[PDB]
Design a protein around this ligand. Structure first.
Ligand SMILES: Nc1ncnc2c1ncn2[C@@H]1O[C@H](COP(=O)(O)OP(=O)(O)CP(=O)(O)O)[C@@H](O)[C@H]1O
Ligand SMILES: N=C(N)NCCCCN
Ligand SMILES: [Mg+2]
Ligand SMILES: [Mg+2]
Ligand SMILES: [N+]
Ligand SMILES: [Zn+2]
Length: 420
C-alpha cells in the first residue's frame, strides 16, 4: 500500500539533521521494502517555538510497501543508528499514515504552522486513527511528524539540499563564492534567496556542524539542477530535492481572523504609526501603531541591517501594513507595506526671491523681509514635506530572511523595492 511517513526532532545542535536522516531512511526503504513516490517534503512549522536551535521543519515522504510493520521497523532502525539520542532536547517522532488519511491531518498541520500544540494532542490523534508510530523518548517529534504529513501546500517551493561526506562534518565547509553569485545572476529568480548581493554574503550555506553542505531554494527541478552543476564546492555525497513551504508566508495570520493578539504567533496587520521610530542597544529600531487591537510594538532588529533605514523614515500618522512574528509583546518585522504616507502641511517663512535664504521675522506684525536686499513679503508659504519614502513594499535582506517569509520577488503586487 501507499503510506505517508513523517519524521522530526532527530538532530541535535551537535551535528545530525532531520532530512539527512530522512534521506537515509529513504535509501534504506528503496532497497528493502518498495520505492519512494515523488519527492520528500520539508515542512516548516511555527517559527516562534522554543526547542528549535534552529529553524523548525519536519520531513515526510510517500512510499509503496506490502507491510506497514516492516516499514516502521526499517524507519525505526535508521533512527536508532543515526539520531542524536544522547541529547536531552532531541526527541524523535515518526508516523506512518495511509494516503487517504493524511488529508484528515490538514487542520493539525495548520495548527502546527500557525499555532501551538501539546503532545497530548498528537497522542489523541494517533489513538483516534490507530496511526502506527514511533516515539523514542519524549514523543515530542510526533507533532512535527503528523504536521509534515497533514500539511496542504497551495504555494510551495523547492530546495535542493546538498550533503557533505561524513569524514567531513564539524569541519569547515569549502566552496567557491563567485561560483554562487554567478549562478544567481544566471538563474535568479528561478533560484532565489541563495545569496545576499547587497551584503556580499553567501546565504545558502550553513555555519553549523551538520551534514548539510548547501540548501538551494528555487522554483523548478530544471533550475535547481542547473544551480547544482554550476556551483563549485567540496565533494557532494548525498543530494535531495525537497518540496517545501519556504517562502510562502504560510505562517501569517490575517488580522480579520483574530480577536486578541498573542505571543508565539505571526501576523499581517494594518495600523497607523503612533510612536515614532527610536533606536536601541544592538542596533534596533522600535515604533508603535494603532490597530483594531490597540497600540502595538513593531521592531526591526539589527540583523535586518539596512532594512532599518527604510523604517527610520517613519512619521506619526503613516498608514502601514506589517508582516512578522510576535514575541515578548513585539512584532519582529519581516516585511512591510507602506500604504498611504501621512500628509504634513507646514507653514514656514517666505524664501527670499533674490538670495534664496529664509526671510527673518520683520518684527511682531510686520511680516517678513530679507535685510540683505530691499525685499519684503507679508505672508507664510505652506508646503508638503518630501521624504525619501515611496509607498509600496519593503523586505529584509536575504541574509535575514526567515524560512517561511515570502520574498517580494514572488509576490505579483506593485511597489516592490527589491534591493540588489
Ligand atoms: N506549532 C508547534 N507547537 C508545538 N510543538 C511544535 C510545533 N511545531 C513543531 N513542534 C515540535 O517542536 C519540536 C521542534 O524542534 P526540532 O528539533 O525538531 O527542530 P526542527 O525542525 O526545528 C529542526 P533542524 O534543521 O536543526 O535539524 C518538534 O518536536 C516538533 O514536533
Ligand atoms: N537556503 C538558502 N538558500 N537561504 C537561507 C537563508 C538563511 C538566512 N539566515
Ligand atoms: Mg530535530
Ligand atoms: Mg523538525
Ligand atoms: N493532506
Ligand atoms: Zn536676499
Amino acid at each position: 500500500m501507499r503510506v505517508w511517513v513523517g519524521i522530526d526532532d532527530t538532530d541535535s545542535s551537535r551535528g545530525m539533521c532531520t532530512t539527512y536522516l530522512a534521506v537515509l531512511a529513504m535509501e534504506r526503504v528503496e532497497r528493502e521494502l518498495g520505492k519512494v513516490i515523488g519527492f520528500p517534503r520539508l515542512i516548516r512549522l511555527n517559527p516562534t517555538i522554543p526547542y528549535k536551535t534552529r529553524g523548525n521543519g519536519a520531513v515526510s515522504f510517500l512510499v509503496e510497501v506490502d507491510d506497514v510493520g516492516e516499514l516502521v521497523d526499517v524507519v525505526n532502525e535508521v533512527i536508532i543508528e543515526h539520531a542524536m539520542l544522547d541529547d536531552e532536547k532531541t526527541n524523535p517522532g515518526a508516523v506512518f499514515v495511509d494516503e487517504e488519511l493524511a488529508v484528515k491531518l490538514k487542520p493539525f498541520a495548520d495548527k502546527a504552522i500557525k499555532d501551538v500544540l501539546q503532545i497530548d494532542e498528537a497522542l489523541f490523534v494517533i489513538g483516534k486513527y490507530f496511526i502506527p508510530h514511533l516515539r523514542h523518548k519524549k514523543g515530542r517529534g510526533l507533532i512535527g511528524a503528523l504536521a509534515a504529513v497533514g500539511a496542504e501546500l497551495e504555494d510551495f517551493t523547492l530546495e535542493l539540499i546538498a550533503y557533505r561526506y561524513p569524514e567531513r562534518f564539524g569541519t569547515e565547509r569549502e566552496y567557491d563564492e563567485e561560483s554562487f553569485f554567478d549562478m544567481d545572476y544566471e538563474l535568479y529568480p528561478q533560484t532565489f534567496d541563495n545569496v545576499d548581493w547587497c551584503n556580499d554574503v553567501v546565504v545558502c550555506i550553513p555555519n553549523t556542524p551538520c551534514p548539510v553542505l548547501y540548501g538551494i531554494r528555487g522554483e523548478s527541478v530544471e533550475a535547481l539542477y542547473k544551480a547544482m552543476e554550476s556551483v563549485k564546492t567540496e565533494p557532494v555525497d548525498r543530494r535531495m530535492i525537497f518540496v517545501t513551504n519556504h517562502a510562502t508566508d504560510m505562517h501569517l495570520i490575517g488580522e480579520e481572523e483574530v480577536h486578541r493578539l498573542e505571543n508565539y504567533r505571526s501576523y499581517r496587520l494594518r495600523g497607523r504609526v503612533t510612536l515614532e521610530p527610536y533606536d536601541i542597544e544592538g542596533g534596533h529600531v522600535f515604533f508603535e501603531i494603532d490597530t483594531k487591537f490597540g497600540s502595538v510594538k513593531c521592531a526591526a532588529f539589527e540583523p535586518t541591517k539596512q532594512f532599518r533605514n527604510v523604517i527610520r523614515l517613519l512619521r506619526k500618522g503613516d498608514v502601514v501594513e506589517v508582516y512578522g512574528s510576535m514575541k515578548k509583546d513585539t512584532i519582529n518585522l519581516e516585511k512591510i507595506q507602506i500604504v498611504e504616507l501621512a500628509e504634513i502641511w507646514v507653514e514656514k517663512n517666505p524664501i527670499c526671491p533674490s538670495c534664496g535664504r529664509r526671510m527673518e521675522s520683520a518684527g511682531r506684525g510686520q511680516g517678513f523681509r530679507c535685510k540683505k536686499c530691499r525685499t519684503k513679503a507679508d505672508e507664510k508659504l505652506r508646503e508638503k514635506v518630501e521624504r525619501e519614502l515611496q509607498p509600496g513594499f519593503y523586505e529584509v535582506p536575504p541574509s535575514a530572511r526567515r524560512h517561511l517569509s515570502k520574498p517580494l520577488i514572488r509576490m505579483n503586487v506593485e511597489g516592490r523595492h527589491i534591493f540588489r
